[PDB]
C-alpha cells in the first residue's frame, strides 16, 4: 500500500519535528527577534539563552540546535515503516550517515535569502551577520544558504520533504552496513512512494524526481565539506568543545 506508506511517513514527520515548512512560513511573515549585529546577538542571548567570544557562543547554540534535531530525526526514523525491523547496528549506521544530510535539507524550510529562523522559531539570525563573523565561523553557513535557495525554488511542501528525508535515511550505500540487501529493498519501496507522490503532487515538473536525486548527491558533498570544517574548528579553536553526541556522529564519518 503505497498511499498508506506515504501517509504514515508524513504523519511521523508532522508528529516528531517541532518546526516544519508551513509553521516556518507563517512565522516568516505577518514576531521573531532579529539578530543582525553584536548588540542584538547579546540581547537575544539574555532573553532566549539566559544561562567567551561571540562566535564561540553562537557555535554552542548551534550545537544545542543540532543535538535536539538529531533526537527528532531518530524518533522520526523509528516511525518509518520497516526501520525498526533492521539490525540495531544498521539503524545506528543509517542515522550516523543520514542525520546531517537530513538536517541541511530541512534547514532550507527555515531559511530565506536574508537569514534563518532559530531557537524554536523565536529568533531570526541574518545571513549578513553570519558572514560578518571572524574566520572560520563565517564560512560555515554560506554553502547551506546557497543549497537552500535552490532547494526552496523546487517549492516542495512538507508531504514531499517527509518522503525525501525518509529516502535520505534509508540508504543502502552507507559504509559498514551489515544487511545491505534488506536496506536496499526498504529504500526501493520508499523511493517508489516518493516517485509516485511527486508525480501526483507536482504534475507541472516532470523532472522533479531526478532533480531530488541530484539534491541527495549534493547533500552528501555538502556534509563531507561541513565535516572538514568541524575538524578545522576542533583542532584549531581553543574554546569550541564538541558535544559528545555530535562527536560520535562525526567520528569516522568521512
Amino acid at each position: 500500500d503505497l498511499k498508506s506508506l506515504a501517509k504514515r511517513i508524513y504523519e511521523a514527520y508532522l508528529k516528531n519535528f517541532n518546526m516544519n515548512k508551513v509553521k516556518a512560513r507563517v512565522i516568516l511573515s505577518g514576531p521573531p527577534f532579529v539578530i543582525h549585529d553584536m548588540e542584538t546577538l547579546c540581547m537575544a542571548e539574555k532573553t532566549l539563552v539566559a544561562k567567551k567570544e561571540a562566535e564561540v557562543r553562537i557555535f554552542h547554540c548551534c550545537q544545542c540546535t543540532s543535538v535536539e534535531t538529531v533526537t527528532e530525526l531518530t524518533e522520526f526514523a523509528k516511525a518509518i515503516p520497516g526501520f525498526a525491523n533492521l539490525d540495531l547496528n544498521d539503524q545506528v549506521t543509517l542515522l550516523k550517515y543520514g542525520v546531517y544530510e537530513a538536517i541541511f535539507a530541512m534547514l532550507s524550510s527555515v531559511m530565506n535569502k536574508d537569514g534563518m529562523l532559530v531557537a524554536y522559531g523565536n529568533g531570526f539570525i541574518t545571513r549578513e551577520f553570519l558572514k560578518s563573523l571572524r574566520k572560520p565561523f563565517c564560512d560555515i553557513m554560506e554553502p547551506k544558504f546557497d543549497f537552500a535557495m535552490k532547494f526552496n525554488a523546487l517549492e516542495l511542501d512538507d508531504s514531499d520533504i517527509s518522503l525525501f528525508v525518509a529516502a535520505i535515511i534509508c540508504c543502502g550505500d552507507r559504509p559498514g552496513l551489515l544487511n545491505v540487501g534488506h536496506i536496499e529493498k526498504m529504500q526501493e519501496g520508499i523511493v517508489h512512494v516518493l516517485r509516485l507522490h511527486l508525480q501526483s503532487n507536482h504534475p507541472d515538473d516532470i523532472f522533479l524526481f531526478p532533480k531530488l536525486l541530484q539534491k541527495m548527491a549534493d547533500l552528501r558533498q555538502l556534509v563531507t565539506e561541513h565535516a572538514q570544517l568541524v575538524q578545522i574548528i576542533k583542532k584549531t579553536e581553543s574554546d569550541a568543545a564538541l558535544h559528545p553526541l555530535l562527536q560520535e556522529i562525526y567520528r569516522d564519518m568521512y
Binding site: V70, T71, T74, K78, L88, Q91, V92, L95, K96, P244, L245, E248, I249
Partner: peptide
C-alpha cells in the same frame, strides 16, 4: 553503547 544507540533504544 554509543549515544546514538542509546537514542534508538529509548
Amino acid at each position: 553503547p554509543s549515544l546514538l544507540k542509546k537514542l534508538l533504544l529509548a
